């Protein structure tokens, strides 16, 4: 520690020069300026372009995240403008770059302190464009950020959320079965978790849509729908009490046939959430006595202690 006040200073008098001058050296300067104990912003703002002239995945990912971290040291409006410029340029690098992980890293770099910058529609449109991507995780980040912005900008974001809900339901009802269907059910779950304010008005439509999926026949898809139902129970609370009977019947039918389905843990957890959130805690063992065996027999058959 005793030499740090010198060593880092010396490194700066190198690193700054290496930031100006070279793609490899500038990449090193970025990576080692971010990771280390330094105290440059104008240099990183232009090195954001210089690290791009490279074909290495790790360089792109780590240097993008490092430029994101470095350009937010102290945020003020000038810092907001600089970070917005460079992060938009990195999102443009995202569309230039077919790599999923680089795009995910760039989008996840968006710290919550810049939410005010995203409050304006001129900047929320960038997130709505980010929703228009082919990768699940990027769209998950976009939904989370947009739903967080829902606290501030209803006039801008409410139609976005409604359009996404309608689109996702249409995709689930029309796009057929596949990995994309599982991703779509997960998308609806993320939208529900991040948008309780809209789903609560529209709980009955979305709940009917979710119920019909399970009542139709597809492992994973049924699992995503079931987890989404449990999440809706968490969000809604007492609203689903009228449906608790049918929902418990469906889930117990699954658990009895758990030997033929994936993630019985999800169904058990879903019953727990449903009864805990709706208040049906003691009716089922009278209405549905068999559960008194199952919850006990599960402890002598299933070998996963989780």
């Amino acid at each position: 520690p005793q030499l740090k006040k010198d060593i880092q200073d010396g490194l700066l008098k190198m690193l700054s020069l290496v930031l100006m001058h070279d793609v490899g050296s500038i990449t090193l300067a970025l990576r080692t300026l971010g990771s280390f104990e330094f105290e440059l912003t104008q240099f990183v703002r232009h090195c954001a372009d210089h690290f791009l002239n490279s074909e290495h995945k790790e360089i792109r990912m780590e240097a993008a995240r490092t430029c994101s971290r470095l350009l937010t040291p102290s945020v003020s409006q000038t810092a907001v403008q600089v970070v917005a410029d460079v992060l938009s340029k990195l999102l443009v690098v995202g569309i230039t770059d077919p790599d999923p992980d680089i795009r995910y890293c760039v989008l996840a770099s968006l710290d919550e302190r810049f939410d005010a910058h995203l409050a304006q529609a001129e900047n929320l449109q960038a997130l709505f464009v980010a929703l228009n991507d082919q990768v699940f995780e990027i769209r998950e980040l976009a939904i989370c950020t947009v739903g967080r912005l829902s606290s501030m900008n209803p006039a801008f974001v409410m139609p976005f959320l409604r359009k996404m809900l309608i689109q996702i339901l249409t995709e689930l009802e029309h796009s057929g079965i596949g990995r994309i269907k599982e991703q779509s059910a997960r998308m609806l779950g993320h939208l529900v978790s991040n948008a309780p304010r809209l789903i609560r008005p529209y709980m009955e439509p979305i709940l009917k849509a979710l119920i019909l999926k399970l009542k139709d026949p597809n492992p994973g898809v049924i699992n995503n729908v079931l987890a989404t139902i449990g999440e809706l129970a968490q969000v809604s609370g007492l609203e689903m009490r009228k449906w608790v009977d049918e929902l418990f019947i469906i889930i117990m039918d699954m658990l009895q046939d758990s030997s033929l389905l994936a993630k019985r843990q999800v169904a058990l957890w879903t019953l727990g959430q449903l009864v805990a959130s709706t208040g049906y805690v003691v009716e089922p063992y009278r209405k549905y006595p068999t559960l008194l065996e199952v919850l006990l027999n599960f402890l002598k058959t299933e070998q996963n202690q989780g």
């Binding site: 409050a119 501030m152 801008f156 139609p159 309608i166 008005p201 439509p205």
Partner: protein
Amino acid sequence: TVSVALVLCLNVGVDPPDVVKTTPCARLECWIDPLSMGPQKALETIGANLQKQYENWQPRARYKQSLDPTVDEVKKLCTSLRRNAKEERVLFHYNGHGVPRPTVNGEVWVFNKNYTQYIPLSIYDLQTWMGSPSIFVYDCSNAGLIVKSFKQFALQREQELEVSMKNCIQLAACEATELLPMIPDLPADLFTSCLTTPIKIALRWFCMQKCVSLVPGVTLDLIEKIPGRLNDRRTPLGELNWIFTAITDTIAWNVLPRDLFQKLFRQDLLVASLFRNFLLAERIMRSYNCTPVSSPRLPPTYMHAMWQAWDLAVDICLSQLPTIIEEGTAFRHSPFFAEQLTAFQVWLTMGVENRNPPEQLPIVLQVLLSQVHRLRALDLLGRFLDLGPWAVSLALSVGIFPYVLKLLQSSARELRPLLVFIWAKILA
């Protein structure tokens, strides 16, 4: 605008020979089905509802009617309209109903109640008679053909004078290449209806076509039974009217140029009503082969994202509607205006002078009407006008200035300090 012409080319519901229509093509007119009544009522009640529906727009206007115009009734009507409105505009309506469809010449077919008893009238004659400026409403099966014909003949008049045109407004149902489709759900006078009761018409169209479960329990029976006077905000109709006008004016101010917006939507009540309803009807009517047509150079306002909020304003309001009608439930005020004022405050909170200016200044203009949201709007304006001088000038350009000026005729001395503060900044 002075005077209005109501030209009724009704051959007592007799179909033309040049069409062969399906069984559910007995489409009403003016919410009246003339096929169930004879000439004395099939021709009269339509005119009665036209008169009522248009007095609802401007009762002051000199309304004149012409049922079964043959030759001389046309000339007397348009001559009288010229005399009353030698310099001002003259509104002029069409239906194109009855026996054979409107043609390029401008004929009428109501001479002696027959397919063959037609009259070779000319558009050039009417344009010569209408030497003054003019407004036209073409609600026809081939209304775009009539628009193209009228543009060409008005251009002919302009060429003849150079070797009324260039001060003309035209609105129409469809394009010349696209006839009105045989949709039973629509009334026959589609373009008269949609510009007349746009609220319930848009509600019905979306209830039929927006195949979404977001608003369960709402059907067309409820839409036909909504209480309200389009200004009584205690019912859905007043709130929906206010919100729809606010949305349309906001999108037009954001999108349309100032040279046309500041004249069409400000210098005449009926022109503003027709154009607002026309943009909403355009959003409805583009969905099928009924491409609307218009005279002024107006970009496609329907594409604007704020129209999505329109659906939300519907989605909330209709969610209350089944008990508003059946159970008489008092309407709950929509959060639309509060949300948009929050958006205005968000733009203010950005603290940047030269982003794109606030899109919600027309919303503020139409929120200064009533106290319950005018107070928030006035506080927001006080915050806004402390920005650079552009914030002042734009407040004059939007049209907020006349409304705040009008608000400075009240006796609310508890409110006057804020109003004088704001008005002192707007006039700077």
